Amino acid sequence: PGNDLLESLHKEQNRWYSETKTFSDSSQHTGRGFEKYWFCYGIKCYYFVMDRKTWSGCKQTCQISSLSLLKIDNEDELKFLKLLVPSDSYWIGLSYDNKKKDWAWINNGPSKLALNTMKYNIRDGGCMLLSKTRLDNDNCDKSFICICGKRLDKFPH
Amino acid sequence: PGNDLLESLHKEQNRWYSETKTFSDSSGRGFEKYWFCYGIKCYYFVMDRKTWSGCKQTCQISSLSLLKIDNEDELKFLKLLVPSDSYWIGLSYDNKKKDWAWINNGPSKLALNTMKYNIRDGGCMLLSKTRLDNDNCDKSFICICGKRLDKFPH
């Protein structure tokens, strides 16, 4: 049972992409379209906004669509995310702001997740991305695909 | 193998069940439900075991539908995600046509191995852990109702 999941993960992935693939506009920068896609896993769904944009654009786009930019909940969600995501980087709700002088998830929301701060040289960025390889830091202002983030709370439909 | 990842599939199954079942789990007893999603589909497990056809019904009166498996992959996962019980998959023996079928036409790329099940054994397929396996449309089981969702969960 190792790769039978991979084999599949990967595939179910390219699969949900093309079923959910849309070029639509956001009624913020209105009639200008951008490509985006989604899929769910567990109690969370993930919506990717593929017009590369920056950590603050990402953050606001997620809020205008009624979501909020990815909080990762535990190492297992982290672990799944890195596996079904294409090969890339993406903004999530992890960064620095100012009284607390530490990273917070875009709301002072909770994760049960290790990280360990001292793995990241601030002088290196103030915003958290993903790769397939782990989490890293970059400048809140260069441009990447964002993932928004919704925690289902009742069973859709 | 035996894997960190299988292992994580298993923690993840406990969090979801824990998130969605119905009781404050105050360490009495209970017989309820849980669910989770996968791709563009959620899975509602109903715990009161029940007739196949009594499973057909629940899924209906819930505007769900006893699970249809769109394909090999969704199966290698549910196979490995789900714990080993036996659950009513919504594939059976067709009112008429001399073959097993998917509750309501079939579009499935699940390509049924057909000439390996014994009707002698039952006309209702289930997922029982090893693969699918048929028993008796009224051995009473865990139902799995699904939904294809068409839009982002509003």
Whether the CB of A76 is below 8 Å from some CB of chain B: the reply is yes
CB contact under 8 A, A42 and B16: yes
Instruction: Pick A76's closest partner by Cβ from B8, B73, B74.
Output: B8
Q: Are B74 and B111 in contact (CB under 8 A)?
A: no
Residue A153, burial from CB neighbour count under 10 angstroms (0-12, 13-18, 19+): exposed
What residue in A sits closest to B16 (Cα-Cα)? A42
Chain centroid to Cα B93, Å, comes to 17
Q: Residue A40 sits in a domain of what CATH number?
A: 3.10.100.10
Partner B contacted by A74 (CB < 8 A): yes
- In chain B, the residue whose alpha carbon lies closest to the alpha carbon of A7 is B73
Between chains, do A40 and B44 touch, taking CB under 8 Å as contact? Answer: no
CA distance B69 to chain A (A): 13
Cβ burial of A39 (10 Å; 0-12, 13-18, 19+) is buried
Nearest by CB to residue B147, choosing from A2, A7, A156, is A156
Q: Do A80 and B12 touch (CB under 8 A)?
A: yes
- Rounded CA-CA distance B8/A98 in Å is 35
Q: Give the nearest partner residue to A4 out of B38, B74, B76, using CB atoms.
A: B76
Evaluate whether A107 touches A93 at the Cβ level (below 8 Å): yes
In a domain, B5, yes or no: no
**Under an 8 A CB cutoff, do B152 and A38 touch?**
yes
User: Distance between CA B83 and CA B129 in Å, rounded?
Assistant: 8
Q: Which residues, other chains included, contact A94 with Cβ-Cβ below 8 Å and sequence gap of 6+?
A: A71, A72, A103, A105, A106, A115, A127, A128, A135
Per the structure, the complete domain to which residue B29 belongs is given by: 21-154
Contact B36, B42 (CB under 8 A): yes
The SS3 of residue A24 is strand
Which tokens in the block code for residue B20? 């969605």
Report yes or no: B145 and B58 within 8 Å, Cβ to Cβ.
Answer: yes
C-alpha A146/C-alpha A54 separation (Å) is: 8
Whether B104 is covered by a domain: the verdict is yes
A142 token code pair: 């260069």
- Report if residue B29 sits inside a domain: yes
Tell me, yes or no, whether A105 lies in a domain: yes
| Structure determined via | X-ray
Contact A5 B152 (CB under 8 A): no
B107 vs A: CB within 8 A: no
What is the C-alpha separation between A133 and B119, in angstroms, rounded?
Answer: 49
Total domains present in chain B: 1
| Subunit contact A39:B36, Cβ cutoff 8 A | no
The answer to whether the Cα torsion of A87, A88, A93, A94 is positive or negative is positive
A20 touches chain B (CB under 8 A): yes
Instruction: Decide if A3 is inside a domain.
Output: no
For residue A10, being part of any structural domain is answered with no
Q: Is residue A11 situated within a structural domain? A: no
Dihedral in degrees, nearest 10, Cα atoms A12, A14, A15, A18: 160
Residue B38: list chain A partners with CB under 8 A.
Answer: 12, 40-41
Q: What is the resolution of this structure in A?
A: 2.5
Least CB-CB distance to B16: which of A11, A19, A43? A43
A9, part of any domain: no
Q: Kindly list the residues from chain B whose CB atom is less than 8 angstroms away from the CB atom of residue A153.
A: none
Does B99 reach chain A within 8 Å, measured CB to CB? no
